Design a protein around this ligand. Structure first.
Ligand code: NA
Ligand code: NI
Ligand code: NI
Length: 114
C-alpha cells in the first residue's frame, strides 16, 4: 500500500524522528495510523501516536474506535504488513516484529478484511 506519511517525508527525515523518539522514550513505540484506500469509514484526525509498549492491540482498537466514533458492532480491522494482529498482542510485540527501517510501526485500518 501507500502511506501519506511516507509520501510526504523522505526516509532520512522519518528515520531521524523515529530513531530520536526511540531513544528519548524507549518504553514507547511510535506508530503511524492511516485508513485503507476506499474504506467507507471515518478518517483519523491524528495519524501519529506514541503508545506504551505494554498497551494491547485490543486497547488500541478502542482508542481508535473512540477517536473516529465507531461502535463495537462496526467492523474495524488493523493491518500491519498485511496481517491482522490478535487483540492480546502488545504494541511492543507488534513493533518488535513489524517496525520499518525508519523506526516507525505502520498500521492501516479498514472496515473489511481484503
Ligand atoms: Na474489530
Ligand atoms: Ni511533515
Ligand atoms: Ni469527534
Amino acid at each position: 500500500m501507500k502511506f501519506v506519511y511516507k509520501e510526504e517525508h523522505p526516509f532520512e527525515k522519518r528515520r531521524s524522528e523515529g530513531e530520536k523518539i526511540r531513544k528519548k522514550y524507549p518504553d514507547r513505540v511510535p506508530v503511524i495510523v492511516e485508513k485503507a484506500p476506499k474504506a467507507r469509514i471515518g478518517d483519523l484526525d491524528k495519524k501519529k501516536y506514541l503508545v506504551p509498549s505494554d498497551l494491547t492491540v485490543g486497547q488500541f482498537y478502542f482508542l481508535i474506535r473512540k477517536r473516529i466514533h465507531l461502535r463495537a458492532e462496526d467492523a474495524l480491522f488493523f493491518f500491519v504488513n498485511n496481517v491482522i494482529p490478535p487483540t492480546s498482542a502488545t504494541m511492543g510485540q507488534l513493533y518488535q516484529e513489524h517496525h520499518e527501517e525508519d523506526f516507525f510501526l505502520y498500521i492501516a485500518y479498514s472496515d473489511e478484511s481484503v
